[PDB]
Amino acid sequence: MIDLRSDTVTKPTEEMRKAMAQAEVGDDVYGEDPTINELERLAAETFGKEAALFVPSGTMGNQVSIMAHTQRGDEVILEADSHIFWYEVGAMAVLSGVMPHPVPGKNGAMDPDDVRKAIRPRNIHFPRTSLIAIENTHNRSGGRVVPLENIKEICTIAKEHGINVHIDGARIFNASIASGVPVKEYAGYADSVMFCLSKGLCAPVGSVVVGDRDFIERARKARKMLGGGMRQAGVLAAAGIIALTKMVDRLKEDHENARFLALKLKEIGYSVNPEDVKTNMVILRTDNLKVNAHGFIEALRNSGVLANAVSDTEIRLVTHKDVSRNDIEEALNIFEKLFRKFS
Amino acid sequence: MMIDLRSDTVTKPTEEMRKAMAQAEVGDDVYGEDPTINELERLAAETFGKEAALFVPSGTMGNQVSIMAHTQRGDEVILEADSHIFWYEVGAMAVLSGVMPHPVPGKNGAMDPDDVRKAIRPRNIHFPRTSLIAIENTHNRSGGRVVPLENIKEICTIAKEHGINVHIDGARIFNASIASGVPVKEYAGYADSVMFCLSKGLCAPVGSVVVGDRDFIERARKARKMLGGGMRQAGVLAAAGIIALTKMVDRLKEDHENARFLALKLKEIGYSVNPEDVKTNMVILRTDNLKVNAHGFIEALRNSGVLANAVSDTEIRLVTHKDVSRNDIEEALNIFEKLFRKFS
Amino acid sequence: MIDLRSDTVTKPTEEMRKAMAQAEVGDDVYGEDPTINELERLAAETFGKEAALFVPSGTMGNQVSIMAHTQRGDEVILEADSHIFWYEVGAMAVLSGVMPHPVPGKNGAMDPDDVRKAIRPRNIHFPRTSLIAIENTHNRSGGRVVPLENIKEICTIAKEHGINVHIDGARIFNASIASGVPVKEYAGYADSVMFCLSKGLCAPVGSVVVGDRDFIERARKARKMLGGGMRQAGVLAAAGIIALTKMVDRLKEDHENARFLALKLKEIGYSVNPEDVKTNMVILRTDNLKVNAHGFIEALRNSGVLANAVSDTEIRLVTHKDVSRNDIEEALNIFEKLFRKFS
Amino acid sequence: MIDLRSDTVTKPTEEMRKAMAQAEVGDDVYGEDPTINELERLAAETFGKEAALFVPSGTMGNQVSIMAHTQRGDEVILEADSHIFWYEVGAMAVLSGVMPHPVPGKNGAMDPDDVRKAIRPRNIHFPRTSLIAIENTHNRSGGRVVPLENIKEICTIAKEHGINVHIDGARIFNASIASGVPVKEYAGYADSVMFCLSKGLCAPVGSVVVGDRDFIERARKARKMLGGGMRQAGVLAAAGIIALTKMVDRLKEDHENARFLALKLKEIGYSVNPEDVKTNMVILRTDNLKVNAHGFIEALRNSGVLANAVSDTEIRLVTHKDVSRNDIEEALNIFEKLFRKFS
Ligand SMILES: Cc1ncc(COP(=O)(O)O)c(CN[C@H](C(=O)O)[C@H](C)O)c1O
Ligand SMILES: Cc1ncc(COP(=O)(O)O)c(CN[C@H](C(=O)O)[C@H](C)O)c1O
Ligand SMILES: Cc1ncc(COP(=O)(O)O)c(CN[C@H](C(=O)O)[C@H](C)O)c1O
Ligand SMILES: [Ca+2]
Ligand SMILES: [Ca+2]
Ligand SMILES: [Ca+2]
Ligand SMILES: [Ca+2]
Ligand SMILES: [Ca+2]
Ligand SMILES: [Ca+2]
Ligand SMILES: [Cl-]
Ligand SMILES: [Cl-]
Ligand SMILES: [Cl-]
Ligand SMILES: [Cl-]
Ligand SMILES: [Cl-]
Ligand SMILES: [Cl-]
């Protein structure tokens, strides 16, 4: 099976397996796991922040950040098609008791003026806007890169209003490789950032939240409350350190494979836009096919290719370390066969 | 005094209401022993063709206990993108029920049935369960617009197929009914619960009512207790409510006629208004062609003796009600005319 | 019917009925109801606080106070048999996301030393103790008065720890009448005080919360969220002013009637302890009767007396304005006849 | 350093490090991790339940169970000194919006009659009692074994009222080893059971919840919301399988060591009760010493012995795989010296 469903399916490299087996560990609840401690120190340093927190998943990373930045009844401004709003089981309402305030965005970039208008005036009928979330390499729009200038202007707006800014940077390294903007620069215009180690970076488990000392202390207590307070998590952190320090550069290979995939799919005749492919995702439309997205995903599966439908007429293809050029070439042969059948 | 066009919530008690309240037969509602509250609820249920009803201190509580009784923690509630529950209820749905709003754009409060269908979440571990669809009749933000019965009917059909609850925020459902000629029981027939206000156009000093099935109302009553709405001798308030429900509905037509007159005349003056959009007691005025924004115009109006609310930086809302007579409207219009000269 | 079920059943006096009819009103959401404003002004003044907030019920008064004093995950120290812990539908957990930390007490008085031990130390595993609640004229213990010294000592402990103090003073005036301690004296040892107007004071609806301006502003927003933001509530406030300003002194009559009732019931042969009757409540045990509390309550109803069973062997009798000495004497004749039948 | 703070400090065995390194993995979100799937299958099998769910910690294990057994506003009956109430950061109130209803217990055993009386009657003022929690091998009381008879009785009561029963079995195997009661028998009197792999069983991370298929489905969704939905978690499950299948028998060694430790401490003169030591814990009182628990803990630390204070006058000592009889002897020599200084 050629897995193009997501970059979450990446498996540990041999270097990672050895590192986990030889991991120096301790009880993290007491802050005594050396490897977890080093991963957090490294993560904080890399993002230009004073502190960091390791978590079991990007969802918990986002949720502890929301809890640490807000109070019950607050409102959180976020992009209309963001992961926090659509794919996190409504956790923000249950855990933090906060309201989402959706703002339309163009490929992840909310117009600064719209953000300004989304901030609630001081009134008894309205919740207090205390957080603005930005997702970089906006998933739903096809792994699009949010311009640094966009984040910079929103940060200015936030500062004037005393509002916190959190970047959902699950794939922030993909954004950095594509844009040439160091992650510490994106983070310089945010109060906190969550990034995943378990997707394109290939770690088996976990993400990290970076930010100020006080913020992280609150997020650490939130993590304890949610059930993320683990013991000898250094076994996971060992692979995390390798993901952070050795798996970033090669992300360019995933981007190269995504573009190649898009160009060939277009050449075949599929409804794809190579010009929109800047990171590791390709959106394919079923508009010119005698079947919808769901029916096409089924056809692909029966032929050996796995992918997810994101709407009734759109499917998402995602490249990563475990889908080589060879697999991309094989996938294309299948796509070519299916095009003749469904065009 | 001032010409108050800010909202219909400012209506004061009629002479008949004051006497009824002061002479109300009461009891302890916690024991379900207040005779006036009981009669108000019986009358409300009957009027909407439902089995039961619950008196609450505000429309906000009416909506929130309904949301609580219809949902479980983590569920999603589909509602109109500019609805009151979403924008003006202090984020209560999140704090009180732990639910997520699922905004669906609507044309004048009417969410496209197919859009509602698409908004229902598929069963997936990543997604919360869609357990409630809320509809606001005479959608406030759009200008007191009337949601067509057929729209509500279509959404009900969709909800039923999916086992989803339907709640109508009918704060001004009687205005909708007067304008459309559709009995409120018909709108309610396509919903599981309906909340309606007695304290706005109907002129009661305090209160709203939620109507629905017996079991739902029992659950809503427990939610009311938890929220702090379980009052004692509330019969004092229910006395005015009975009069509002039974004698103040027909005259809403007068408020509509006044709002239409106001809109037509504002249009003649040259203001950015759409008389064709005015079917109930509200008029939206845009300040696009004025040399001042909404807030600046509101201040100028206040300075001239007219009260109104800005609903955006370019829009103002004018609301008619029992306490603004046709003569008051004429006076406001004469002022609106002079201000047009000053700001045009 | 002679209603001894509770003081909540009190009906409006003729004075109140007239006041409600001619009450000057306005939209309270805009802070424009003159009568509500005067009631809050008078209440704040009466308890020596900066501000006050009118609410639909004592339950909401307690809940908006908890919300205004706490943050999600905090702990609230309260008496093990208090109304907030027992009869408020678990609202503190749902509305504020806080956890109760029950402390046993002797007739409503928690041992100051136990309160100190209940304060959580700073640790990632523990919620932060941010509030201590005290109930005066403790309901479940039979309308007992909490000593001023107890409240004074707990206030000292709270201050030393930066913890807020809330007095559930639903029947604080009854406490004051019995102890001779002015309500301002009680209030001085608390950050906030909730007191009911709808019980012994005879108003038909409402309670009031008093405290500092910032606290009341937060409580007012909580009231809006909960659904307590009414419009022309001046009609209710008119009766409320009369309840607060003219119905306090006569509470002494309820206390006298309760004691008289108790002394005579004991004389008849009922299991009552007149010595325990400190305010307007009398606890009657049914152990020596041929039927239990529920069966006896039914026999009483048949004879024209209403009361509530609080357990299988206990009945609570409560006196109030609508229970005159003549009603007490008539009730006693009924109790006399029933003792002949059920002893 | 001789670590007697907790059994959570246990480090991975050689067999475990190798297993993690070669673990076959997959994306758990897709239910595709074969090692996680095998661990859950084995757990369900071992406890005689239909399904199982791996979680990052015992705290999440308890919290997803509570969320899956209850609705907002419900009440949960639990032992007055249970972990869920004291050491889980008020999570039940924030996550589930439920109220704890503490019930006194003798070393973790709540009197069945007290439990019956704690169940709320159907009344608008009361929350609905939807769950009863029992902690077998009650931590606070000193790792005490709750009698099977007690659990059976409470199960009978729960059935009568249609109430769910959850056993916090963080140390259910220690209880089984000491009582001779198979874990499957304990589980038979409960709807759900949470047990840890990260304590005495020596896994670096994780716990498991077992129960009916529908309950586990709800718990799994709760896990996703809380942020416990990991990817290639098989790395951790590999050590978990070894913990569950190979590390149970040797727990007897920890019990022998704890008993020996207690016996010798008593001979030295310390306030311990060797007769109360049946599993891997020893409670040491400081009432007969010159310093309190906190001061004695600091003295022990300076001498090479780590332990935690559980109150101002009580210290908890816990044995585990990483504490050999030799380590206990060395510790005893240290305690001996300190008795001379602080007795
Ligand atoms: C921007 C962003 N933020 C947060 C998260 C949540 O992280 P996890 O909880 O999956 O580790 C994801 C993962 N997303 C998953 C994927 O893409 O396969 C799916 C969509 O849930 C994400 O893409
Ligand atoms: C559709 C609808 N639903 C619910 C409510 C809430 O009712 P209350 O809580 O104010 O009684 C309102 C009141 N609305 C008020 C007004 O129009 O003046 C303001 C906007 O909050 C409403 O218009
Ligand atoms: C009965 C019981 N239930 C649940 C938990 C929570 O498990 P984790 O979240 O620590 O994995 C613990 C851990 N307990 C810890 C320890 O003993 O060192 C401390 C006390 O929090 C426990 O003892
Ligand atoms: Ca991975
Ligand atoms: Ca090749
Ligand atoms: Ca009104
Ligand atoms: Ca005129
Ligand atoms: Ca009363
Ligand atoms: Ca361990
Ligand atoms: Cl190690
Ligand atoms: Cl009456
Ligand atoms: Cl729920
Ligand atoms: Cl008036
Ligand atoms: Cl908060
Ligand atoms: Cl593998």
- Ligand 3 proximal residues by C-beta, below 6 Å: A 229; C 125; D 6, 8, 57-59, 62, 83, 87, 135, 139, 168, 170, 196, 198, 207
Instruction: Tell whether B240 and B322 lie within a shared domain.
Output: no
Instruction: Judge whether B78 lies within some domain.
Output: yes
Instruction: Judge whether B339 lies within some domain.
Output: no
Contact B125 D73 (CB under 8 A): no
CA–CA gap between residue C238 and residue C57 (Å, rounded)? 16
Instruction: Tell whether D200 and D253 lie within a shared domain.
Output: no
Region class of B300: left (phi > 0), else alpha (psi between -120 and 50), else beta:
alpha
Contacts of C71 in chain A (CB under 8 A): 71-72
Structure tokens at A7: 């970059």
Contact D126 C89 (CB under 8 A): yes
Mutation choice for B interface testing from D123, D221, D226 by most B CBs within 10 A: D221
Residues 6+ apart with CB under 8 A from C55: B228, C61, C64, C194, C206, C207, C208, C209, C223, C228
DSSP bridge pairs for B76: B100, B130
Instruction: Judge whether B340 lies within some domain.
Output: no
Instruction: Judge whether C162 lies within some domain.
Output: yes
Instruction: Tell whether B81 and B193 lie within a shared domain.
Output: yes
CA–CA gap between residue D166 and residue D131 (Å, rounded)? 7
Chains in contact with chain B (at least 3 beta-carbon pairs closer than 8 A): A, C, D
- End-to-end alpha carbon distance in chain D: 23
Which ligand 3 atom minimizes the distance to the CA of A229?
9
Instruction: Judge whether B131 lies within some domain.
Output: yes
DSSP bridge pairs for D101: D77
Q: % helix / strand / coil in chain A, to the nearest 5? A: 45, 15, 35
Structure tokens at A305: 């290719």
CA–CA gap between residue C193 and residue C184 (Å, rounded)? 10
- Cα pseudo-dihedral D236, D241, D242, D248, rounded to 10: 120
Tell me how many degrees the CA angle B135-B136-B141 measures, rounded to the nearest 5: 135
Partner C, chain A 137-176, Cβ-Cβ below 8 Å: none
Contact D90 A21 (CB under 8 A): no
Contacts of C99 in chain D (CB under 8 A): 90, 92-93, 100
Instruction: Tell whether D141 and D204 lie within a shared domain.
Output: yes
Instruction: State which of A246, A270, A286 marks the end of a domain.
Output: A246
Any ligand 1 atom below 6 A from CB of A316:
no
Instruction: Tell whether C97 and C171 lie within a shared domain.
Output: yes
Inter-residue contact B173 to B145 (CB < 8 Å): no
Substitution candidate for ligand 3 out of D6, D82, D139, D317 with most atoms within 8 A of CB: D139
State which amino acid sits at residue D291.
Answer: V
Instruction: Judge whether D45 lies within some domain.
Output: yes
State which amino acid sits at residue A327.
Answer: D
Nearest residue (CA) to ligand 3, atom 18: D6
Strand order across the beta sheet in which C129-135 lies? C51-55, C207-211, C192-196, C164-168, C129-135, C75-79, C99-103
Q: State whether residue B293 sits within 8 Å of chain C by CB.
A: no
List the domain range (segments joined by +) for residue D206: 2-246
Contacts of C90 in chain D (CB under 8 A): 73-75, 97-99, 127
Q: State whether residue A73 sits within 8 Å of chain C by CB.
A: yes
Helix (H) or strand (E) holding C130: strand C129-135
CATH number of A61's domain: 3.40.640.10
Nearest alpha-carbon partner for C233 in C203, C213, C201, C206 = C206
C41 is in an annotated binding site: no
How many separate domains does chain C show? Answer: 2
CA–CA gap between residue C275 and residue C144 (Å, rounded)? 11
Instruction: Tell whether D241 and D261 lie within a shared domain.
Output: no
CATH number of B299's domain: 3.90.1150.10
Instruction: Tell whether C173 and C226 lie within a shared domain.
Output: yes
Which ligand 2 atom minimizes the distance to the CA of B83?
1
> Quick one: how far is CA C339 from the chain centroid?
32
Mutation choice for C interface testing from A28, A63, A64, A124 by most C CBs within 10 A: A124
Instruction: Judge whether D337 lies within some domain.
Output: no
Q: A125 to chain D nearest CA, in Å?
A: 24
Contact B236 C234 (CB under 8 A): no
Give the residue ranges of the annotated binding site of A for Ca(2+).
10, 198, 232, 288, 322, 326, 329, 343
Chains in contact with chain C (at least 3 beta-carbon pairs closer than 8 A): A, B, D
Which ligand 2 atom minimizes the distance to the CA of B136?
1
Instruction: State which of A226, A246, A266 marks the end of a domain.
Output: A246
Helix (H) or strand (E) holding B307: strand B306-307
**CA gyration radius for chain C?**
21
Residue D74 CA, ligand 12 centroid: distance in Å: 9
Structure tokens at A134: 């930005």
Q: State whether residue D264 sits within 8 Å of chain B by CB.
A: no
Residues 6+ apart with CB under 8 A from C15: C242, C246
Inter-residue contact D105 to D83 (CB < 8 Å): no
Instruction: Tell whether D254 and D275 lie within a shared domain.
Output: yes
Q: State whether residue B94 sits within 8 Å of chain D by CB.
A: no
DSSP code for B188: H
Give the residue carrying structure tokens 């607060």.
C244
Instruction: Tell whether C254 and C239 lie within a shared domain.
Output: no
Burial class of residue C23 (count of CB atoms within 10 Å of its CB; 0-12, 13-18, 19+): buried
Nearest alpha-carbon partner for B157 in B193, B122, B113 = B113
**Solving technique for this entry?**
X-ray
Instruction: State which of B190, B212, B247 marks the end of a domain.
Output: B247
Nearest alpha-carbon partner for A262 in A253, A271, A251, A249 = A271
Contact C90 B227 (CB under 8 A): no
DSSP bridge pairs for B102: B78
Q: State whether residue A57 sits within 8 Å of chain D by CB.
A: yes
Nearest to B73 among A74, A88, A94 (CB): A94
Residue D51 CA, ligand 9 centroid: distance in Å: 24
- Cα pseudo-dihedral D76, D78, D81, D85, rounded to 10: -30
Q: A233 to chain D nearest CA, in Å?
A: 6
Inter-residue contact D315 to D293 (CB < 8 Å): yes
The CA distances from residue D45 to B289, D39, D49, D52, D183, in Å, are 75, 10, 6, 9, 11
Residues 6+ apart with CB under 8 A from C271: C284, C285, C286, C287, C288
Residues 6+ apart with CB under 8 A from C297: C307, C308, C309, C315
Instruction: Judge whether B259 lies within some domain.
Output: yes
Instruction: Tell whether B154 and B222 lie within a shared domain.
Output: yes
**CA gyration radius for chain A?**
20
**Per-residue b/e over C267-289, b at no fewer than 16 CB within 10 Å?**
eeebebebeebbbbbbbbebeeb
3-state secondary structure at position B9: helix
Contact C96 A71 (CB under 8 A): no
Instruction: Tell whether A234 and A259 lie within a shared domain.
Output: no
The closest ligand to the CA of B244 turns out to be 6
The CA distances from residue D96 to A94, A224, C322, in Å, are 8, 16, 43
Any ligand 1 atom below 6 A from CB of A83:
yes
Taking one residue from A and the other from B, the number of pairs with CB-CB distance under 8 angstroms is 61
Give the residue ranges of the annotated binding site of B.
11, 59-60, 172, 199, 232-233, 289, 323, 327, 330, 344
State which amino acid sits at residue D33.
Answer: D
Instruction: Tell whether C74 and C97 lie within a shared domain.
Output: yes
